[PDB]
Subunit: 463 residues, 4 copies
């Protein structure tokens, strides 16, 4: 009876129908396809396997495509050997991709490394392992002074704290991956390294161009620029993914937690899904139990008010995926049990808030919602109702998409002819769902005599 | 645009169709038929006239039948001449008509004055003018001691606080009047001499016996016993009439105010209509303008939260009825203008209606449209004193008439309401058509869906 | 056990020490001296009598001087007989006093009757008995049309609804009446027919000139102009008296109670005393019992949140004064019994501390709030929030001790001196026990001003008796 | 601008006065002396050094003594070499010390290991590295089945989840350490492995017996039994230390989070100090920067409402003590910056509660940047602190111990005064010191809280002043 949802990164070890079924049973709600690794055949087969399991078992789940995204990385070294960098030495970055790199200098993939950077800026290498301060920028070169000792290797990630990185919204591979996403008919697209509105709009147009207009865009906030432009990004997006690990490398350490809480809170207010990802249960990639701190982080993330929590590497390429999903689910359950509701504003707001409040007054274990796009369910969900949300819809895509929202059980129905019919059918399905029984009060929310996008009716019934 | 309703007692001076129309224009909402004096031809004609005015103008109104009830009075004295009494002496009451007695002893009209009464009880005469306490009970006589000086007159009213008089709520005249009421198909019956729940039940039974089961009973609280059993009387009744003047004769002046307020509050809580009736604008029976104290009293009575106010004598046999109704209406509007909403085992109806008013208030909705069969939903919404006017759609004419007595509700008779969506459509149409709301205004729409009649469970917000 | 205070107009039947004692026992708190009637010897004797009763019994009370004020009256008629006026006729008012007046015309005392009035204005005579509409104004005459039939007599009051009457704030006798008041050392001055702030300023300035600077001025709102300019009058005044009867003839009838309610509300907020006065229990002048409506009126006036209620004629020249005071006290008690506190959600320190004091007192079930005051401000500041607890006011100022008698739910106590805050707590606790209003074990909240002059209240302390 | 206090475990890296001074500048408020290691001369030297720094700089600080406590540990192995235990094997624990231990069996130091433990119970070894399931208990032996592969070594700690361990409240060394604590006149004593009220009482009596009655006892909750008896333990104690690391091996992991939050909450209500300890910034033992997760953990611990946060190892034997204290202080400042007041809104509460709540409320209402408090024992300051006032608490006291001890309470600045003769005197002196502190300025509103005409333990008067 947990409400917060679980996104599971599926890989070679958990792609089989058996494992997927066990994963769904364990508490999995959404399959993440990390396009940082794999080819189309694999991902396609995972999709097919999952949906067949879904078809066979009658279990519900969503499919999310996570792009690799554009990134600045170092390149090849002399003889393929790592080098050791010392503190205080003159290190240089060149934008020439033909350059093989040694101690003194290395090449980067980004053609704007010289342009975007300024003298005094910080350059981090290999997930913040090695830090450098730019001393000079000349021609195609960026001359820096090393701040700390460390060993540089091949193809390491580069982070530029507080720097606006003129990279495209989509790498060329990402564009093709999105087309694949449209072909497969995924429910979500998690766009990596979103820094501004134009990026999201570009994602949207790219989708639109290949019949993916109904696919929801989850903007991944990974650095300061994206955090600064969070409002427009959120307004333009259908959801947000809080990437703590990257933020930990991009912004001051003491600020990440408030970025998470702030983004979660704003996501909650906007009735849009939010996912807290990375650095979740990483220790369980090799161990059968997570550490206390991890459980704490996850629990607190749930208490912040997250729609979903994500497993990355634990469930994909880890030695104990089911254990991770299981303990994650227990944490979810334990945390959800003790959370309470949070009670010019418009119709939808007043009606949904009033519906939750009314539900709370009458000890209703269920709030049934008639939805076409999924907006009403999220509108009711906004207030963290004690009641489970039974979202009845004739749209599979939204039915799938609602799987990601907290505390909502979506259900596909043939048709809803009217409001009274919705009440009848809703009562029937409310009893059929097993979430409520005879004698229980149920609150029923819908849009009457209005187009989609407005919630204005609330009705109380006894089962 | 007043919310509080005005009940007007109609008499020969105000029975005409033109005058009734003028009275309706002035602010009249309900016609009171005081059967304390008059015949069936008059009242019937009054009813017919009102209904004619209603038919021609398209104006809505209710008809209230007020029973006279039984009374204990003193009897005949020497030569039809006045007399005089003394304090501290031995006054005696006998259950014997033939006995005449100016002082020392007196006869009463009620057979069993000796029987029901007990030693220690108080006997009041002429609206509490003279009080005495029962000293002993023997045979056909009961000796009492006078507590205060006063002059006794011919055939004066008698009050017995806390004493069960054991007379029925209805005499043969009241019974026939009530049957007449059922025949005429009146909307309300204001029952006199209600002391306890059984009295109300008897009225109900008499009604039901003549096809008046849907007629609402307004119980008149006019005595101490009725005040003690107010809860049961209220539970059994459809509404209450607060008779301050009559209570003033049975209880201390210091308790009447809070008795009124308490009865009004409890009536409001129970979704039962309440009427403040006696000593309203009595001076306007003789004068064209009321006194400050009266207007103040009325205003405070409205502020207490009464559904309606009654003119009794001002509108019936007074020289300035139209003026009284007018100034009453101005007072009503003026008082209603500055009143705020009053938000609140808790059930559905309560939660939905309260939530509906709250939602209406939050969104600046000028109208709350309500679907009603029995009228309970409109009254349930009214309970919270909505700033918005209640537009009550019903297929029941009786309730449509009866809702005229409830505060801030405009009843509307419709042919049919087939469903909830149909109710929303028709409600929007009539909301616009009524002129109380226009394009752009939000309206909250309240009804019962897939539930019995007496239950309200749906609230929906729409834009016109 | 009542909180609402009772002002009683004293006359020949209640002028004796015995009756005054009885009146105090019945529930009287303040003596009103209506200088519309009486001479200086009489009023002086009343004052002396009250002070004697107070000295002998040891009970506390206040003395209020009510001025007559300026008046517009009609004058004498032919043969000293009333005349009967008919509606629609031509009645004229003349400024020539020497004129004896008949049906057609009568003289008035005010020489600006033509100036202040305009065509269309209403002229009322004898407490709204006779109404007239101004048709024309010529020379020293005001030509009017009678609206209703009535008998006009000699020396009748004239009322002008909604008309600004350019009469002075003080009549010639009133100055000497106030001087007498200062000499006698009265506690309050009730000024009649206050229409504007300047009037209050004039009274205050006059009192200031004769050692009456410490006397509180209560402005009587009796007409449209005074009501329209109520805020400035309240700001300028120390208190207000709501004259319903006088307002009732001056403003629309449906507006009188909301004027009362509005004015009472503002007085409490301003921490100034308010008195609900005229048309209280007048029926008890001839009858031994009040009417229901009157009792209702008193109760509602108290429920509005008035500090005190006034008897005018009931207590002076009525057949049943003691009965009136008694039933008044009973009504006060019955109404006060069911009133609760008003704990908001401008305001400053004093407000915050006093509000907090009441809050804490009620939170801890304290039946008593002891307050140290020099001017009486802290007690009224605490009183503003209608504490369930009785307010015990300690003072080294006799005048404030007298004046606090009018404030609701305040028991004044004259103390020798208050040397410090701890000393105040000690003395307050002691006197709290001595008062008998509190007992051993009871919690008491103690409010005072620490390290600040006598105009701000900043300390609140909780003690157990 | 931070209100949350920082407890720093001092070691070889931070034992000098210079380092102590820098540590105080960095944000250190309390020195923790971990008696799991060291001798009296060393700790004494540490105390002397801190007190010297305090004497020279005029800075205030507290000294907290952390006991090693009793423990169940394994004993010696063959040749001093690790042995490898495999999953599914029959392992045995013996109460015979003289036994040197191999792959099959090892001895434990605790004699009631046989008695307290039962069949089915779990046995964890070496900080939960190796887990075993008890299959049978015979004689002096406890037969168990190993659940996971692992290497067992010499002198490793043993944890018994959910087991009531009849160990004494105080080890023999702890007692002499406490006597030393009394000798040195420490401000706090952190008692290890508290499971029940009696344990607290024993320590209290032991202190009392050696003139340490004014020393505050912080009960360290490290297992389920202590968590079960938390209320009475808190009742008997002056404060609590939430040992998350120890809890993580003793109770279900998903329960640890709410145990921390629950205990912080109850400590706040009880007007007693609470310290969130262990697994704070451990990564900084090796690195110059903490992990995001660590900062998050600390921040949330502060947001839960802990009075203080504790460094253990970061400040003692780490390569980056200053960095750890500094970033810790930064976290404290950043987190404290955005916290709001928590005003009550359990049926009946008394005077002190009403006065203090009302004082904070009034303080907030008038935008008072400072609340001055008169205290003898520190209860009033802690009583005011309960509501997390935005205003700083300036605590005036004639008690040196209380001045020192209040350094641990959140958002309170203690000040030692010679005398307070009366309430007006307190207002005068308080206003003076309020101005002198630089925490308030001319014109600013100050709320002044104290006990007037009442014994110690009672706060009953609150007064508003303009400086």
């Amino acid at each position: 009876m947990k409400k917060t949802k679980i996104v599971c990164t599926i890989g070679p070890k958990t792609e089989s129908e058996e494992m997927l079924a066990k994963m769904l049973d364990a508490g999995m709600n959404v399959m993440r396809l990390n396009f940082s690794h794999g080819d189309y055949a694999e991902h396609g087969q995972r999709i097919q396997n999952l949906r067949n399991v879904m078809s066979k078992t009658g279990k519900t789940a969503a499919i999310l495509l996570d792009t690799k995204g554009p990134e600045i990385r170092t390149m090849k070294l002399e003889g393929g050997n790592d080098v050791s960098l010392k503190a205080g030495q003159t290190f240089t970055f060149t934008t020439d991709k033909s350059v093989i790199g040694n101690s003194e200098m290395v090449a980067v993939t980004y053609e704007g490394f010289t342009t975007d950077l300024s003298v005094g800026n910080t350059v981090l290498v290999d997930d913040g392992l090695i830090g450098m301060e730019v001393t000079a920028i000349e021609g195609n070169k960026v001359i820096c002074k090393v701040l700390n000792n460390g060993d540089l290797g091949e193809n390491k990630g580069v982070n530029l704290p507080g720097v606006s990185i003129a990279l495209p919204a989509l790498a060329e591979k990402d564009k093709q991956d999105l087309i694949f996403g449209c072909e497969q008919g995924v429910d979500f697209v998690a766009a990596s390294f979103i820094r501004k509105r134009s990026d999201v709009i570009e994602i949207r147009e790219h989708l639109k161009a290949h019949g993916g207009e109904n696919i929801h865009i989850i903007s991944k906030i990974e650095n300061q620029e994206g955090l600064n432009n969070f409002d427009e990004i959120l307004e333009a997006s259908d959801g947000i993914m809080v990437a703590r690990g990257d933020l930990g490398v991009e912004i001051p350490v003491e600020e990440v937690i408030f970025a998470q809480k702030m983004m979660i809170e704003k996501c909650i207010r906007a009735r849009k899904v939010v996912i807290t990802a990375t650095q979740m249960l990483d220790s369980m990639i090799k161990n059968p139990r997570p550490t206390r701190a991890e459980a704490g982080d996850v629990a607190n993330a749930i208490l912040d008010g997250t729609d979903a929590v994500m497993l990355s590497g634990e469930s994909a390429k880890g030695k104990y995926p089911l254990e991770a999903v299981s303990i994650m689910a227990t944490i979810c359950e334990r945390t959800d049990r003790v959370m309470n509701s949070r009670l010019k504003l418009r119709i939808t707001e007043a009606v949904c808030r009033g519906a939750v409040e009314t539900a709370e007054k009458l000890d209703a274990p269920l709030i049934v919602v008639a939805t076409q796009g999924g907006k009403s369910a999220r509108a009711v969900r906004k207030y963290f109702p004690d009641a489970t949300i039974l979202a009845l819809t004739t749209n599979e895509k939204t039915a799938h998409q609602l799987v990601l929202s907290k505390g909502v059980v979506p259900q596909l129905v043939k048709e809803i002819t009217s409001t009274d019919d919705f009440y009848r059918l809703g009562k029937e399905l409310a009893l059929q769902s097993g979430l409520a029984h005879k004698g229980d009060v149920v609150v029923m929310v819908s849009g009457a005599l209005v187009p989609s996008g407005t919630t204005n009716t609330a009705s109380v019934h006894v089962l």
